Design a protein around this ligand. Structure first.
Ligand code: NAG
Lengths: 49, 223, 214, 49, 314, 49
């Protein structure tokens, strides 16, 4: 999930107001990417033997 | 220009009656209610009566019902209060006022009020008792001579010093009514203390209602 | 017959300050309320009528509003001429009742009074009674009292008092407090004294005399 | 942003962004817990292999 | 309007099926009061409403302050009430040269009494005598028996707070229905199979307009998806059914060697065309800009996705 | 709701409903993390059995 467009994209005003929360939503974007990576690691542990 | 002018007050003894009038100018009476309000000396205000000029219907305070009658005349553009069965408990400054509808609206404009007084002592001119200065040291080096104006009726009285020439440093009290049926008030003059043996200090009590005056010399006493 | 409560009983504020006085009715009064201003020696003047309508000849400084059942009267900026007693009237259900009325004081520097004692004189005592007089002159604020002592004991139930109106420039006033004794009681006590207490007096003013003195 | 006067929009936008971010945080937190449980199953499968 | 209604009985104009220009009222600026609540006055002809309403009446100048959400007062509670969640504009102006009469204009009336408060947009035109006291009035006028309806003292000599004001309140109603009241934005013809911005009766979005492979029933103008947004529309002037596809997008990632070996990198644009984003490679995972390709299989180094990996060779 | 002027009451109520919800969300998340842990102890118990 990309928090910029999730909240509102394609707009200067939408971006400017999301940025008032600083790095908070960046952390969610990172958690989700990290989960997807971990899910590949699970697949590799099970099959790449 | 809107004006209300009251008239007809005076002194009426118990068992008598008094008619008050109030003229209107700058506006009509029609469409308005007219009211009278009473203020006894030393008291706040109490309503007496109201009339709707365009209807003739009235209302009275329960406390005055059967004694105080209200009416209005739209040809003359004036209004009246007929106060009967007067007692010494009914003495007050009587005000005229106007308002909208029977009620639910406040009063817009009042007159100045005319004073009626009554007592067990129907009238008396004043007399004056002197008050000695302290013989001891005071703050600021100042001192005063005073007096008590006693046993007169009715109020107002005008009180001044040095036969009316001295107003500087003069401080006086409102009169209050005593058990004698008569009014009293104290008065002082504060000056540098050495002036109390130099200047003249005669209390001048002017009482127009009894056609009298009191010229009372106040002096330091040995002490 | 709707009863009014006006509050505070007294308010103090300097010139130029914002003053709010409130009135509450015991019952509904619609918008029938009138606001009056009374100066010493003068008839009450009308400021506001029917809750929010300004009376002609009244400064724009006088205004008000209503919230719920609370009626608020405001002077946006006090002038030296606005130190007067204020009242509320509710012209809804007759008899029409007014509130108690409230005062506004200038907040002048606080000071103690010139205090004189007049021991009963030989001439006054000819009446068969005695009158001891303590007079406090030209002082501030409005609130002050005199406690009497007889033979250094606190006195009670044997005194009377009268207080005057405040001065047009300084709002100072004088206070008169007396003791009533029969001549026979005057003769039974040796020492009389006036103890003056109020906000401007750091140490109660005590003045005294012996019977028969001055 | 097209409805309210810019500062009025800022107030309503802040209410909306905050609620959206909280919904994402709940989503991610719950997903992280599920990810851990799935990882345990994946490791168990790898062990069975 | 030549004449306005009394506040006790305000007029309610129901407005639908029109092109509404609010900028005109704003720009003329003939109003002393022009305050919008829940909506901006700043030329908002972009938004459209299912219906709008215009409520009109005459009140005193000091009473103009009550025509707002969150208010109490003689008008706010007994003559003209707005909801606290109101969306709309309050517009007012001085009518001294229209509503002033010699002797006073007593045609305008207000309610002084009611036994309860009004609901938002409720009107009460009853003259039944209000009983303030405990005894029955039985239709008789008097103390504690009031005609609830009273005239305004709109005298020709009154100061500003007592002058009559003409007030119009424009309420904006947005339902899940076609906007029949919509501003005069320049009308444009639809462009098919291209990424465009859309505004269909005030409902906006961005997407690629395409012919629909499904039909809609005649009673409705649009359909919606899982996120409650527009899925497809019927054009409002010609009833064609067109789908709205989101415009191409995706995350952008960079494939890089360690920056101690080389600096040749490629940018992978997830699920998009190489013409939308010389060394240009299009695959299913996305487009790689700054990369070449080989059709042979090898060991994986940096994954692209869907069975394809990037690596470095001479 | 029985003490305040309705529009002010509404705002303070919204603040309290939100605070009460946050407490429920907190409880559930803590129990959810703990539930994963109790399952882990239980999976160990099942293994020991
Ligand atoms: C562009 O990308 C879209 C969506 O991924 C795809 O449907 C289309 O076939 C692509 N076009 C080309 C020319 O690659």
């Amino acid at each position: 999930v990309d928090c910029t467009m999730y909240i509102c994209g394609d707009s200067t005003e939408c971006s400017n107001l999301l940025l008032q929360y600083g790095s908070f939503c960046t952390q969610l974007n990172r958690a989700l990417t990290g989960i997807a990576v971990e899910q590949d690691k699970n697949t590799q542990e099970v099959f790449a033997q | 220009e809107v004006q209300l002018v009251e008239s007809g007050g005076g002194l009426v003894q118990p068992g008598g009656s008094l008619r008050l009038s109030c003229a209107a100018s700058g506006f009509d009476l029609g469409g308005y209610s007219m009211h009278w309000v009473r203020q006894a000396p030393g008291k706040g205000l109490e309503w007496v009566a109201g009339i709707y000029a365009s209807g003739g219907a009235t209302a009275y305070a329960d406390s005055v019902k059967g004694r105080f009658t209200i009416s209005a005349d739209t040809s003359k553009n004036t209004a009246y209060l007929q106060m009967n069965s007067l007692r010494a408990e009914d003495t007050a400054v009587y005000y005229c006022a106007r308002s909208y509808y029977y009620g639910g609206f406040g009063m817009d404009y009042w007159g100045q009020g005319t004073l009626v007084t009554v007592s067990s002592a129907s009238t008396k001119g004043p007399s004056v008792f002197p008050l000695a200065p302290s013989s001891k040291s005071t703050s600021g080096g100042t001192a005063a001579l005073g007096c008590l104006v006693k046993d007169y009726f009715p109020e107002p009285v005008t009180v001044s010093w040095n036969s009316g020439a001295l107003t500087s440093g003069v401080h006086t009290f409102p009169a209050v009514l005593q058990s004698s049926g008569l009014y009293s008030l104290s008065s002082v003059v504060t000056v540098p203390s050495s002036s109390l043996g130099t200047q003249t200090y005669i209390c001048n009590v002017n009482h127009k209602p009894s056609n009298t005056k009191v010229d009372k010399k106040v002096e330091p006493k040995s002490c | 017959d709707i009863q009014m409560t006006q509050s505070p009983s007294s308010l103090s504020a300097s010139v130029g300050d914002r003053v709010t006085i409130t009135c509450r009715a015991s019952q509904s009064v619609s918008s029938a309320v009138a606001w009056y201003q009374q100066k010493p020696g003068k008839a009450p003047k009308l400021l506001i009528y029917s809750a929010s309508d300004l009376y002609s000849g009244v400064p724009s400084r006088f205004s008000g509003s209503r919230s719920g059942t609370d009626f608020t009267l405001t002077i946006s900026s006090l002038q030296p001429e606005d130190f007067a007693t204020y009242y509320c009237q509710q012209s809804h259900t007759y008899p029409i009742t007014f509130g108690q009325g409230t005062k506004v004081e200038i907040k002048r520097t606080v000071a103690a009074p010139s205090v004189f004692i007049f021991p009963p004189s030989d001439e006054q005592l000819k009446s068969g009674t005695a009158s001891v007089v303590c007079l406090l002159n030209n002082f501030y604020p409005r609130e002050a009292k005199v406690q009497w002592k007889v033979d250094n004991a606190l006195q009670s139930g044997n005194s009377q008092e009268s207080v005057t109106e405040q001065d047009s420039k300084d709002s100072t006033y004088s206070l008169s407090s007396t003791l009533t004794l029969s001549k026979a009681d005057y003769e039974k006590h040796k020492v009389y004294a006036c103890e003056v207490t109020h906000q401007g007096l750091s140490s109660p003013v005590t003045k005294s005399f012996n019977r028969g003195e001055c | 942003l097209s409805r309210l006067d810019p500062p009025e929009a800022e107030v309503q936008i802040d209410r909306l962004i905050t609620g959206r971010l909280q919904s994402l945080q709940t989503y991610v937190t719950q997903q992280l817990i599920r990810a851990a449980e799935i990882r345990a199953s994946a490791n168990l499968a790898a062990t069975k292999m | 309007a030549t004449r306005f209604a009394s506040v006790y009985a305000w007029n309610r104009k129901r407005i639908s099926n029109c092109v509404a220009d609010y900028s005109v009222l704003y720009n003329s600026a003939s109003f002393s009061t022009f305050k919008c609540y829940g909506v901006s006055p700043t030329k908002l002809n972009d938004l459209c409403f299912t219906n709008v309403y215009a409520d009109s009446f005459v009140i005193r100048g000091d009473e103009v302050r009550q025509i707002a959400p969150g208010q109490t007062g003689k008008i706010a509670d007994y003559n003209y009430k707005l909801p606290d969640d109101f969306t709309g504009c309050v517009i007012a102006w001085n009518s001294n040269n229209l509503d002033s009469k010699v002797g006073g204009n007593y045609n305008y009336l207000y309610r002084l009494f009611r036994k309860s408060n009004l609901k938002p947009f409720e009107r009460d035109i009853s003259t039944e005598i209000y009983q303030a006291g405990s005894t029955p009035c039985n239709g008789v006028e008097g103390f504690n028996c009031y005609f609830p309806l009273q005239s305004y003292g709109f005298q020709p000599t009154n100061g500003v707070g007592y002058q009559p004001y003409r007030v119009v309140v424009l309420s904006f109603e947005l339902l899940h229905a076609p906007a029949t009241v919509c501003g005069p934005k320049k009308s444009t013809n639809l462009v098919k199979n291209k990424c465009v911005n859309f505004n269909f009766n005030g409902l906006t979005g961005t997407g690629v307009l395409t012919e629909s492979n499904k039909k809609f029933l005649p009673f409705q103008q649009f359909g919606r998806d899982i996120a409650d947004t527009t899925d497809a529309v019927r054009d409002p002037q010609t009833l064609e059914i067109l789908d709205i596809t989101p415009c191409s997008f995706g995350g952008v990632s960079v494939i890089t060697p360690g920056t101690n070996t080389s600096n040749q990198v490629a940018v992978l644009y997830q699920d998009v065309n190489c013409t939308e984003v010389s060394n240009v490679f299009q695959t299913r995972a996305g487009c790689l800009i700054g990369a070449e390709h080989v059709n042979n299989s090898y060991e994986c180094d940096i994954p692209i996705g869907a069975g394809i990996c990037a690596s470095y060779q001479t």
